[PDB]
Design a protein around this ligand. Structure first.
Ligand code: HEM
Ligand code: HEM
Ligand SMILES: [C-]#N
Ligand SMILES: [C-]#N
Lengths: 127, 127
């Protein structure tokens, strides 16, 4: 359980978190207006691959997508405080669906602190 | 009293390590987009000078560049865990290419531990 990725249960956990997140996005009145496709399967795959690589897992994200330029990839979309908050709600819901044996208090806090900081940093629009 | 630098084979060892590192960088989906495409020779040379000096070799780095100030020198770049991990991956490959006669287990571990700690200290961005 060296890497954060391995410590929290690896592929199975990230699939669990991101699938639950994207299931929430699908119903989300705020986020549905911003995610461009009806079929959110691609978006879910890419976010999952990114998070898996970020926390020390497989490098499939950069193999398929190249270098992470996260600001430029969000630039087409108007992400104001309102979208940021909806994103964080869906993530908090997804993370709360994971049990504490799998995701212990320390790793849970660390992941949540990361997602909070990252989402604030991606706000790119006043409205 | 023998320096780490001389113990590990001095200039030839550091040249091999940094040269191989830069060759891995060029094949790395993450890092090839980060290092300066038009300044790779000079960049390779600065890293070699730095490492040679850090480990007790020539102090040419400080004469030419002053105090390392690595945080400020990496400030122009968004280094997240993604870039940290890619750097260490490339560095691990370069270091592994050096034989254990030249670079024995004790010196190998000390070099790797340094690179690990230093790469972590240069993380400056969430993505
Ligand atoms: C701040 C609230 C956010 C909103 C509203 C948002 C929305 C979006 C949208 C609409 C896309 C394009 C979806 C598509 O491909 O069809 C996208 C892509 C992406 N997002 Fe977010 N996002 C947010 C925050 C984040 C955060 C915090 C992260 C990771 C830390 C993240 C990681 C990614 C990644 C990796 C992609 C795909 C990049 C690629 O093209 O490879 N996003 N996001
Ligand atoms: C953490 C991941 C890292 C990334 C993405 C990264 C990337 C870069 C880049 C793009 C440059 C500019 C190259 C140039 O034009 O000189 C640079 C410079 C440099 N890096 Fe790194 N680096 C990382 C870690 C490290 C580490 C761990 C060390 C310590 C061994 C280091 C030592 C240096 C030195 C000495 C320079 C040149 C400074 C100068 O201009 O005098 N870097 N780095
Ligand atoms: C972004 N999801
Ligand atoms: C820095 N290389």
């Amino acid at each position: 359980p060296k890497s954060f990725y391995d410590a929290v249960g690896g592929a199975k956990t990230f699939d669990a978190i991101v699938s639950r997140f994207y299931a929430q996005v699908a119903e989300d009145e705020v986020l549905r207006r911003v995610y461009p496709e009806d079929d959110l399967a691609g978006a879910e795959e890419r976010l999952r691959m990114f998070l898996e690589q970020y926390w020390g897992g497989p490098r499939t994200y950069s193999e398929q997508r190249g270098h992470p330029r996260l600001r430029m990839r969000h630039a087409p979309f108007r992400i104001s405080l309102i979208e940021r908050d909806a994103f964080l709600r869906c993530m908090h819901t997804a993370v709360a669906s994971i049990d504490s044996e799998t995701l212990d208090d320390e790793h849970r806090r660390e992941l949540l602190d990361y997602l909070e900081m990252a989402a604030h940093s991606l706000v790119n629009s006043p409205f």
